[PDB]
Amino acid sequence: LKARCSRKALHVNFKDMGWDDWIIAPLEYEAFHCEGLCEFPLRSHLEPTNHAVIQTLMNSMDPESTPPTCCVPTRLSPISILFIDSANNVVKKDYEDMVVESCGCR
Amino acid sequence: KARCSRKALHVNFKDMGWDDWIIAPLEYEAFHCEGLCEFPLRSHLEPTNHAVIQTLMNSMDPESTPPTCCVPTRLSPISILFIDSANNVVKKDYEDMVVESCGCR
Amino acid sequence: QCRIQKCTTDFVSLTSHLNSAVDGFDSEFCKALRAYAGCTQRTSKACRGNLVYHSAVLGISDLMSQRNCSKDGPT
Amino acid sequence: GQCRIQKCTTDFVSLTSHLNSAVDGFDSEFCKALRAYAGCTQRTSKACRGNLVYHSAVLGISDLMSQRNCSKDGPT
Ligand SMILES: *[C@@H]1O[C@H](CO)[C@@H](O)[C@H](O)[C@H]1NC(C)=O
Ligand SMILES: [Cl-]
Ligand SMILES: [Cl-]
Ligand SMILES: [Cl-]
């Protein structure tokens, strides 16, 4: 079935990726992902740009003139990663835009 | 099977009947984004860290997550001259009306 | 004030359960669309110049034409 | 001197963008480009430590080489 634009689970396991040779912690985190239909009308929480408002309108009126807008992360949050840096030192650093906080149509 | 690109999208306010309140412009080029976001993402698609990881995971196992999506990453305004509620002629920048760049998010 | 988002929220709430593959999609959709049209008309003056409003008005009108929803009818 | 993964990726994308599986030598040309991409990324490993673009390139390359059955050693 074709769900509407929603935030869905996405588990990232750094150990499974072999990245524990440089990442110390965390070795896994919840990243989420966005997925689903962007249909007219965009609900307010999909927080469209003016462009997405117009494109969604045009795709509704003529799906051949433009494709629909796309369900993508509209707010993301960082996670703090403890890792071994290029100088072989322990570094704690915020990695921005790692966790989807909200999805929307763009 | 085209890769993420900025494509033409012409908006005609007169065709939409908005020329009863919009004075100018009555048309403009909005563009739109469309196309595959495939591993590896070229630098100009400007992925977030999240998009980098998602594209990687979808490359390794398309069942684990869908690909990232081609969407506007930079937009620009257009100035619209129109009449507002109080019959005032207003000139206003409408933000985020024109796709300047597309990328994978 | 422009209250288009109230109209949209109502329309989305009312149609959120609709699945195009289920047997009564168009009849519930049209009633919903008619109410959405009425709601958007009641905030029209306050919303002039608001792209979300103008897009809603046109999108609704187009859908009601596409789906052959009568102008008047139950809501 | 610094992290230069973007050059590696640009080269790989430039070299393979036209490739289409409907033509004969898709997989061989793709594997050649993949090996070159793997080599380019390997040579900037230290400078790129902690750059997710780099680490995902390394892993995605290794995974693609497995998926497309590209020998790790071979022409580029
Ligand atoms: C790689 O080898 C596997 C196992 O024989 C095969 O199923 C797959 O189709 C091959 N793919 C390519 C691109 O050669
Ligand atoms: Cl931590
Ligand atoms: Cl009615
Ligand atoms: Cl090979």
Author numbering:
A (entry chain B): 396 to 501
B (entry chain A): 397 to 501
C (entry chain C): 53 to 127
D (entry chain D): 52 to 127
Sentences from the paper on this structure:
To characterize the RGM–GDF5 interactions, we determined the crystal structure of RGMBND in complex with GDF5 at 1.7 Å resolution. In the complex, the disulfide-linked GDF5 dimer binds two RGMBND molecules that are related by a noncrystallographic pseudo twofold axis (RMSD of 0.21 Å for 143 equivalent Cα atoms of the 1:1 RGMB:GDF5 complexes). RGMBND forms a bundle of three α-helices stabilized by three disulfide bonds. It binds to the finger region of GDF5 and interacts with both GDF5 molecules of the dimer. The RGMBND–GDF5 interface comprises mixed charged and hydrophobic interactions (containing 116 nonbonded contacts and 5 hydrogen bonds) mediated by 20 residues from each binding partner and buries a total surface area of 1,929 Å2. The side-chain of RGMB Leu103 inserts into the hydrophobic pocket on GDF5 formed by Trp414, Trp417, Ile449, Tyr490, and Met493 and is shielded by a hydrogen bond formed by RGMB Gly101 (“RGD-loop”) and GDF5 Tyr490. A major interface is formed by the side-chain of RGMB His106 that stacks onto GDF5 Trp417. This π–π stacking is shielded from the solvent by RGMB Arg100. Our 1.7 Å crystal structure allowed us to identify a network of well-ordered water molecules contributing to the RGMB–GDF5 interactions. The side-chain of RGMB His106 forms a hydrogen bond with the amide of Gly101 from the “RGD-loop” and a water molecule that extends a hydrophilic network to Tyr105, Trp414, and Asp416 of GDF5.
Repulsive guidance molecules (RGMs) are cell surface proteins that control processes ranging from brain development to iron metabolism. RGMs can bind to the cell guidance receptor Neogenin (NEO1) and act as coreceptors for the bone morphogenetic proteins (BMPs). Structural analysis of RGMs and their complexes with NEO1 and BMP2 revealed a common RGM architecture comprising an N-terminal domain (RGMND) essential for BMP binding and a C-terminal domain (RGMCD) sufficient for NEO1 binding. Here, we determined high-resolution structures of all three human RGMs in complex with the BMP ligand growth differentiation factor 5 (GDF5) and the ternary complex of GDF5 with RGM and NEO1.
